[PDB]
């Protein structure tokens, strides 16, 4: 491919990498286990406070 | 380091951040690499040939099997044998 | 090739007046470094600095388009540039963020609330954020908010910053014609020049010729905002796009900016924030202690005078003139919406901003409904 097409392909790859990483973060943050753990830690700190 | 050393208005000497970058790289400190990158240090202006050669010749951090690979390819290229202990891997 | 043949630029060909330092000319640049017409004798030429900036370092990698334009260019050409060459649709909302050029630190809760509000307001309505461009103070806070937005959200906030061309660091690094130029986010503390903000989307870096001095972008930014507000919104009910003015901290000049915004046809609502300090705090102290607008009694008048003379370190007559400008601003007390951290100050930036826009338009409920339909805000 040419150079503009190479830039377009590289930008598409960076978009895909960002999409995948932060969607993985959204999946981790919306899971039941992470929610339960965050709630328990907040409830413990809230009980001491 | 994030909450005290990298506070707002902190004066930084020229070239010290790249030295801290090299020291964090040779000691396998991923979060310090992240913090230094987020605090202005760029890999394009930092990474040189000599710095990469120093990174390949470091002795800190975890163990690796790179020396055995270098010894094997040196034995295959020039059939010598065991590398000298004070060998700089080019 | 259209950018070079449409936009122009100016450079310092003067008689080199030393004023104080023999190397420092009227433009401030070095005496041998050379190559308005009053004392600068500047000449006009096609531009040589436009394209794309690749922000190297500073965490996330972000590409920001840029163009160097003259300070006297007509805003229609600039708006055509953003709509056509940069492929930006016409915004449903314009936000003008003003503040102090000096760096400052705010409370953590106030900073988090302000950043989340600015991000959500620019996201839901698809607005344009207008900053000072360089990475100083309030624009630094906006850049931190955009960094958080990139760290936890999937949108692309259009955050066009307008900065003086002569005050940005590494001016030779941004020289090119439609060429991607790398930029360094490192800023030398010894140099008085400041770097551009890393997390901005577009730049309208304006050159009046001079280097290291401000004032080369205020008139162009105001004219561009007026020209944008003159454009009709896509609802076609008979209204232009709404313009708000967010003020954080600020100095003596932002009071004059607020006066220019309020005493305008059409009027522009102004939203201020409390807890940052300086001019925003004196505006808030005026707003709570105001009674019937300009009807301010003597005791709080003297309190305002002494707080102006203490915070801004001004003289007696300067504080009196600033209080006169405050009262001239206050005559229009209905437009100014004051956000207070905690309490019953809408508990959010965006409720205050959108409510201020709704009663700054001051039109019929069909017009407010069409504005809310354009912003896709059913809750508002």
mmCIF file of N, CA, C and O in Angstrom, chain A residues 25-43:
data_model
loop_
_atom_site.group_PDB
_atom_site.id
_atom_site.type_symbol
_atom_site.label_atom_id
_atom_site.label_comp_id
_atom_site.label_asym_id
_atom_site.label_seq_id
_atom_site.Cartn_x
_atom_site.Cartn_y
_atom_site.Cartn_z
ATOM 1 N N UNK A 25 -11.654 -2.610 30.027
ATOM 2 C CA UNK A 25 -11.788 -1.919 31.305
ATOM 3 C C UNK A 25 -13.253 -1.770 31.714
ATOM 4 O O UNK A 25 -13.588 -1.928 32.893
ATOM 5 N N UNK A 26 -14.128 -1.479 30.751
ATOM 6 C CA UNK A 26 -15.552 -1.346 31.041
ATOM 7 C C UNK A 26 -16.170 -2.684 31.437
ATOM 8 O O UNK A 26 -17.061 -2.727 32.292
ATOM 9 N N UNK A 27 -15.726 -3.769 30.802
ATOM 10 C CA UNK A 27 -16.176 -5.107 31.172
ATOM 11 C C UNK A 27 -15.702 -5.485 32.568
ATOM 12 O O UNK A 27 -16.447 -6.108 33.335
ATOM 13 N N UNK A 28 -14.459 -5.136 32.906
ATOM 14 C CA UNK A 28 -13.943 -5.427 34.239
ATOM 15 C C UNK A 28 -14.657 -4.604 35.302
ATOM 16 O O UNK A 28 -14.931 -5.098 36.401
ATOM 17 N N UNK A 29 -14.957 -3.345 34.995
ATOM 18 C CA UNK A 29 -15.571 -2.450 35.965
ATOM 19 C C UNK A 29 -17.052 -2.715 36.185
ATOM 20 O O UNK A 29 -17.586 -2.340 37.233
ATOM 21 N N UNK A 30 -17.724 -3.351 35.229
ATOM 22 C CA UNK A 30 -19.145 -3.636 35.339
ATOM 23 C C UNK A 30 -19.426 -5.076 35.746
ATOM 24 O O UNK A 30 -20.591 -5.486 35.763
ATOM 25 N N UNK A 31 -18.396 -5.854 36.060
ATOM 26 C CA UNK A 31 -18.619 -7.224 36.489
ATOM 27 C C UNK A 31 -19.174 -7.256 37.908
ATOM 28 O O UNK A 31 -18.983 -6.331 38.703
ATOM 29 N N UNK A 32 -19.848 -8.362 38.227
ATOM 30 C CA UNK A 32 -20.427 -8.536 39.556
ATOM 31 C C UNK A 32 -19.355 -8.623 40.634
ATOM 32 O O UNK A 32 -19.537 -8.102 41.740
ATOM 33 N N UNK A 33 -18.231 -9.278 40.331
ATOM 34 C CA UNK A 33 -17.184 -9.472 41.332
ATOM 35 C C UNK A 33 -16.517 -8.154 41.709
ATOM 36 O O UNK A 33 -16.309 -7.871 42.895
ATOM 37 N N UNK A 34 -16.177 -7.336 40.710
ATOM 38 C CA UNK A 34 -15.558 -6.042 40.986
ATOM 39 C C UNK A 34 -16.530 -5.110 41.695
ATOM 40 O O UNK A 34 -16.133 -4.367 42.601
ATOM 41 N N UNK A 35 -17.810 -5.149 41.304
ATOM 42 C CA UNK A 35 -18.820 -4.340 41.980
ATOM 43 C C UNK A 35 -18.949 -4.733 43.444
ATOM 44 O O UNK A 35 -18.859 -3.875 44.328
ATOM 45 N N UNK A 36 -19.021 -6.040 43.714
ATOM 46 C CA UNK A 36 -19.142 -6.547 45.079
ATOM 47 C C UNK A 36 -17.917 -6.177 45.910
ATOM 48 O O UNK A 36 -18.041 -5.752 47.067
ATOM 49 N N UNK A 37 -16.717 -6.300 45.329
ATOM 50 C CA UNK A 37 -15.498 -5.961 46.059
ATOM 51 C C UNK A 37 -15.427 -4.471 46.384
ATOM 52 O O UNK A 37 -15.074 -4.092 47.512
ATOM 53 N N UNK A 38 -15.761 -3.617 45.412
ATOM 54 C CA UNK A 38 -15.744 -2.173 45.634
ATOM 55 C C UNK A 38 -16.777 -1.785 46.683
ATOM 56 O O UNK A 38 -16.508 -0.956 47.565
ATOM 57 N N UNK A 39 -17.961 -2.402 46.625
ATOM 58 C CA UNK A 39 -19.007 -2.115 47.597
ATOM 59 C C UNK A 39 -18.585 -2.535 48.999
ATOM 60 O O UNK A 39 -18.818 -1.802 49.965
ATOM 61 N N UNK A 40 -17.934 -3.695 49.126
ATOM 62 C CA UNK A 40 -17.499 -4.153 50.443
ATOM 63 C C UNK A 40 -16.409 -3.255 51.019
ATOM 64 O O UNK A 40 -16.438 -2.931 52.214
ATOM 65 N N UNK A 41 -15.454 -2.823 50.186
ATOM 66 C CA UNK A 41 -14.410 -1.921 50.674
ATOM 67 C C UNK A 41 -14.983 -0.563 51.067
ATOM 68 O O UNK A 41 -14.602 0.006 52.106
ATOM 69 N N UNK A 42 -15.938 -0.057 50.281
ATOM 70 C CA UNK A 42 -16.550 1.217 50.629
ATOM 71 C C UNK A 42 -17.383 1.102 51.895
ATOM 72 O O UNK A 42 -17.393 2.022 52.716
ATOM 73 N N UNK A 43 -18.063 -0.029 52.081
ATOM 74 C CA UNK A 43 -18.883 -0.235 53.268
ATOM 75 C C UNK A 43 -18.008 -0.358 54.514
ATOM 76 O O UNK A 43 -18.359 0.152 55.582
#
